[PDB]
């Protein structure tokens, strides 16, 4: 059997934040990752 090997999904994690002056709420961007791989 021939099997393709695709490297396991990886990418940077960025934190979208307003200033700590404004709020402690943050969003998180998993770069180039489908919303299924993210835990």
């Amino acid at each position: 059997e021939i099997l393709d090997i695709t490297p396991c999904s990886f990418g940077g994690v960025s934190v979208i934040t307003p200033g700590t002056n404004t709020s402690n709420q943050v969003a998180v961007l998993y770069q180039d990752v489908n919303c299924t791989e993210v835990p």
Binding site: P7, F10, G11, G12, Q31, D32
Partner: peptide, 23 residues
Amino acid sequence: KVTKFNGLTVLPPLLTDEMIAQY
């Protein structure tokens, strides 16, 4: 006319080709 997985990522540009076309 104008024509990988080792820790190498390509970030998409902030302005899509559609937005540059609108500009």
